[PDB]
Amino acid sequence: QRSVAVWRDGAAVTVPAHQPVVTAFDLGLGRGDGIFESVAVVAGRTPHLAAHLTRLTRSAALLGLPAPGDQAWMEMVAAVLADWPAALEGVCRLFLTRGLGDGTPPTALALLAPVPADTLRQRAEGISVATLGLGVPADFRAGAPWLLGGAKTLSYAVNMAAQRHAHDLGADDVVFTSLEGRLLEGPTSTVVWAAGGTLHTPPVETGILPGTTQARLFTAAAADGWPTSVTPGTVDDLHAADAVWLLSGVRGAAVVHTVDGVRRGDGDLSRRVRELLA
Amino acid sequence: QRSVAVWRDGAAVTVPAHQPVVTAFDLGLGRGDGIFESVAVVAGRTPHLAAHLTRLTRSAALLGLPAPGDQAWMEMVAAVLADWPAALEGVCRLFLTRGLGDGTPPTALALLAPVPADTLRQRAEGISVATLGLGVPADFRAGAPWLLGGAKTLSYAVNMAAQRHAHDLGADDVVFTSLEGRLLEGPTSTVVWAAGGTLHTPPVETGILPGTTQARLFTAAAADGWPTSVTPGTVDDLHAADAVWLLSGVRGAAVVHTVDGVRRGDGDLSRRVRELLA
Ligand SMILES: Cc1ncc(COP(=O)(O)O)c(CN)c1O
Ligand SMILES: Cc1ncc(COP(=O)(O)O)c(CN)c1O
Ligand code: NA
Ligand code: NA
Ligand code: NA
Ligand code: NA
C-alpha cells in the first residue's frame, strides 16, 4: 500500500503511512518552500537513485537548503523499501523542506506508493497534450535566479493547475512554451521529439529542469548511433516531428499522439526509445 | 506561544502546536497545491476576518478546491484564539489543501503564532526594497488562468526565494515588475505610492493578489477626501513618488525608505495612511 520514513535524530524511522508527519508551521506546507525528487521503484530496487540524489543536491543548493547528504537518503529509501512488494512498481518521493525556518533543521522524509494504474496506462497507450504559455521569455530565467529555474521545488500549484486546465480541454498533459513560442517542458516531464534521424530536446538554459530520463535516453542513443541534439524547437517542431514523447522517472516514455487536438503518429520510433531506456 | 486547530469530522479540534497534522501524501505539502489566508490577531480579536474569508472563497474557486465555508473557518479561528493573550499580536493562517487528491476531502486547518519582533520593527521603522522582474508581460496572466494570478496559493517558493535574493543585496523585501517594467506587487504585500495628492496602486488585471489592506486604505481614503487611483506605474513612479508603502494584513503599512539602494523620504504622508488603517 504506502510507506513513509522520517529523518529523526540522524536515523530513518519508519512511521505508518496514514500518520501525520509534518506540523502546521512547516514551511514546505505553508510556503511550498522545499525540494523533492521522485524515484522509480521497479522489482523492489531504485535503478536510478544516484541520478536523483545528484539532482536533489543541485535543487537544495539553488534554494539554500541544508541537505542531509546521500547516506541519509539511501537509509530513508531502505526503510520504505523494507516490506515493499517487488511485483508492484512504486514511486518513492524524497522531500526536503525549510522546516520551521532557516536556523532550525530542515525536514527530510521518504514516501513510497504504487505508480497509479492510469499512469501505467499513459505509458502503455500514450497521451494528448495541450500547449500552454508560461509567458516568460526563453532567455529570462538564466538572468533571474529568484524564479528557481532548474530547481525541483514543492511549489507545483501552477504545474497541477495547467494539467487540470488541459484535462478540461480533453487533453492528458501539457507542454509549456516561452513567450516567443519556444518549447520548455511538461509540468512533470521532459519533451523529446525525433526529426531528420535526430533525437531533439529543448535547452536547459531556458530555466527548465534537467531531466534524468531524457539524459539517460541521450547517453544510450549516442552509444547506439542515434544522433541527439539540444534544439530550440517550437510547437511547429512537435506537429512536424516523426515522433514526440514526454519523458519522466515515474511515467517513463509517454508517446504524445495528439498536440492541441492534432493527432500524430510516432513513425514506429517508440520501440527503439523504449529499448534504449531499458 | 503557538496554537493549531484541524477540521476533523465537521468540528474544530485543538491539537498541540508541535504535533504533526499533515501526512507525507498531502498535496499541500508535496505539490504546494492549496490556498491560504493570513489573518491579523489584535487584542485577541480578528478585526478583518470576513475580508480574508471572502478572498479564501475566491482562491479556492480558482484552484477548484471544495471549501468548508465561513462557519467552519470561524470555528477553527475560535479554537486557536481560546487561550491566546490579548496583549500579543498574532498571525492566524488558514490552510486549505487538495489533501490526498480531488475526490478525497481537502485538508483544513488554522495555525496561530505571534507576529515576529522583526516584522513589528519593519512596521515601526520601514524597509528597503529590491525591484525584481517576474519576466511575465503585465497583460499575460489575464489570458492564462493556469498561472493562478489573483489566487493566494501554498506555492510561494519563488516569493520566498526573491526575498532571500533581496536580503543578499542588503534589502528587506521586493517589488516584482512585469517584463515591460510595470509594478506588480510584493512577494507578500501590495504596493501603494502617493503622487500629485493621489494614492496609487497597480491594477489587479495584471494577475496580482487583490490586497485587503490596500482595499480598506482606499475605502477609508475616499471617505477622508484623499483621492485614490488604479495606476499602471513603473519603478520610475516609486523613485518619483512623495511616499511608497508595502501593505499587508500581518506587517501592516511598511514605509519603503529605499528603492534599489536609492534612499527616499515619505513627505510625512505615512501618519495619515496609518490613521486611515486604524
Ligand atoms: C518540471 C519537471 N520537468 C521534468 C521532469 C522530468 O525529470 P525526470 O526525467 O528526472 O523524472 C520532472 C519530473 N521530475 C518535472 O517535475
Ligand atoms: C502575494 C501577495 N500580495 C499581496 C498581499 C497583501 O494582501 P493582504 O493586504 O490581504 O494581507 C499578500 C499577503 N496576503 C500576498 O501574499
Ligand atoms: Na505522470
Ligand atoms: Na517503456
Ligand atoms: Na512581512
Ligand atoms: Na500603523
* In a shared domain, residues B172 and B186: yes
Q: Mind giving me the DSSP string for chain B?
A: --EEEEEETTEEEEE-TTS--B-TT-HHHHS--EEEEEEEEBTTB-TTHHHHHHHHHHHHHHTT-----HHHHHHHHHHHHTT--TTS-EEEEEEEE-TTSBTBPPEEEEEEEEPPHHHHHHHHH-EEEEEEE--S-TTTGGG-GGG-TT--BS--HHHHHHHHHHHHHT-SEEEEE-TTSBB---SSSEEEEEETTEEEE--GGGS----HHHHHHHHHHHHHT--EEE---BHHHHHHSSEEEEEETTTEEEEEEEETTEE---TT-HHHHHHHH-
CA B76 to chain CA centroid, nearest Å: 20
* A170 and A251, same domain (yes or no): yes
The SS3 assignment for A98 reads coil
Distance of CA B266 to the CA centre of its chain: 23
Resolution stated for this PDB structure, in Å = 1.8
**β pairing state of B190-195 and A198-201:** unpaired
Nearest-angstrom CA–CA distance, B18 and B12: 17
Task: Identify which of A32, A64, A97 has the shortest CB distance to residue B156.
Answer: A32
Q: CA quadruple A101, A102, A103, A105: dihedral positive or negative?
A: positive
Residues A175, A245 within the same domain: yes
Q: According to the annotation, is A44 in a ligand binding site? A: no
DSSP string computed for B204-253: GGGS----HHHHHHHHHHHHHT--EEE---BHHHHHHSSEEEEEETTTEE
- Do B127 and B259 lie in a common domain? yes
Are A135 and A209 part of one and the same domain? Answer: yes
Q: Are residues A131 and A269 in the same domain?
A: yes
Assess contact for A156 and A187: CB atoms under 8 A. Answer: yes
Q: Which domain holds residue B88?
A: 3-114
Residue A159 contacts residue A188 (beta carbons within 8 Å): yes
User: Angle between the B270-277 and B212-224 helix axes, to the nearest 10 degrees?
Assistant: 100
- Judge whether B260 and B169 are in contact, CB under 8 Å: no
Experimental determination technique: X-ray
Residue A239: C-alpha distances to residues A234, A262, B95 (Å): 9, 8, 42
Is B156 annotated in a binding site? The answer is: yes
Strand partners, B99: none
Residues A126 and A257 in one domain: yes
The CATH number covering residue B82 comes to 3.30.470.10
Q: Helix A212-224 crosses helix A270-277 at what angle (to 10 degrees)?
A: 100
Neighbours of B39 (CB within 10 A): 25
DSSP A192-210: EEEETTEEEE--GGGS---
Same domain, B136 and B272: yes
> Of the candidates B94, B65, B99, which has an alpha carbon nearest to the alpha carbon of residue B78?
B94
> Of B272, B267, B190, whose CA–CA distance to B227 is shortest?
B272
Q: How far apart are CA B222 and CA B276, in angstroms?
A: 10
C-beta atoms of A134 and B147 within 8 A: yes
Cα distances from B130 to residues A20, A109, B155, in angstroms, run 38, 35, 21
C-alpha dist (Å) from residue B276 to A67, A222, A235, B67, B157 = 46, 68, 52, 32, 33
Write the single-letter amino acid at B163: Q
Tell me the CA distances in angstroms from A159 to A42, A155, B196, B241, one per residue in order: 26, 8, 42, 38
> What residues of B are in contact with residue A34 (Cβ under 8 Å)?
157
Beta carbons within 8 Å of B220's beta carbon, 6+ residues apart = B276, B277
What is the C-alpha separation between A77 and A79, in angstroms, rounded?
6
CA distances from B205 to A94, A259, B143, B154 (A): 38, 30, 10, 21
How far apart CA A58 and CA A55 sit, in angstroms, is 5
- Domain end (from A97, A114, A131): A114
Give me the total of CB pairs closer than 8 Å, taking one residue from chain A and one from chain B.
184
Segment holding A5, helix H or strand E: strand A3-8
Rounded Cα gap, residues A42 and A87, in angstroms: 8
Cα B21 to chain center, whole Å? 24
Contact between A149 and A142 under an 8 Å Cβ cutoff? The reply is: yes
Given A114, A145, A175, which residue is the final one in a domain?
A: A114
Rg, chain B, Cα only? 19
Contacts B161 to A, Cβ<8 Å = 63, 145-148
Sign of CA dihedral B56, B61, B64, B65: positive
SS3 at position A242: coil
Instruction: Output the nine-digit C-alpha cell for A131.
Output: 500547449
- Cα B118 to Cα B196: distance, rounded to the nearest angstrom: 32
Q: Do B154 and A22 touch (CB under 8 A)?
A: no
In chain A, count of helices (H) and strands (E)?
8, 13
CA–CA separation, B118 and B156 (whole Å):
20
Residue A79, sorted as left (phi over 0), alpha (psi -120 to 50) or beta, turns out to be alpha
B159 and B264 share one domain? yes
As a whole number of angstroms, the distance between CA A242 and CA A205 comes to: 25
- Residue A154 and residue A152: Cα distance in Å, rounded? 7
Give the span between the Cα atoms of B229 and B224, in whole angstroms: 15
Q: Measuring CA to CA, which residue among A248, A3, A250, A251 is closest to residue A112?
A: A3
Spell out where A107-215 has E strands: 107-114, 127-133, 173-177, 190-195, 198-201
The verdict on a CB contact (< 8 Å) between B133 and A156 is no
Ligand 2 atom nearest residue B212's Cα = 10
Q: Write the CATH number for A141.
A: 3.20.10.10
The CA–CA distances, whole Å, from B222 to B119, B194, B215, B216 equal: 28, 14, 11, 10
Residue whose entry in the numeric block shows the C-alpha cell 535516453: A217
Domain count, chain A: 2
> Which amino acid is residue A127, in one-letter code?
I
Q: Give me the phi and psi of A203, to 5 degrees please.
A: -70, 140
The verdict on A173 and A237 lying in the same domain is yes
Query: Cα B199 to chain center, whole Å?
Result: 19
Q: How far apart are CA A131 and CA A177, in angstroms?
A: 7
Do residue A137 and residue B19 have CB atoms under 8 angstroms apart? Answer: no
Residue B212 to chain A, least CA–CA distance (Å): 20
Q: Ligand 1, closest atom to CA A209? A: 3
Cβ atoms of A15 and A21 within 8 Å: the answer is yes
Neighbour-count burial of B93, counting CB atoms closer than 10 A to its CB (0-12 exposed, 13-18 middle, 19+ buried): buried
Q: Are residues A28 and A89 in the same domain?
A: yes
Radius of gyration, alpha carbons of chain A: 19
**Are residue B33 and residue B90 in the same domain, yes or no?**
yes
Distance CA B265, CA B131 (A): 18
Beta carbons within 8 Å of A34's beta carbon, 6+ residues apart: A27, A28, A63, A65, A95, A96, A97, A98, A106, A107, A153, A154, B157
Tell which of B75, B93, B114 closes a domain.
Answer: B114
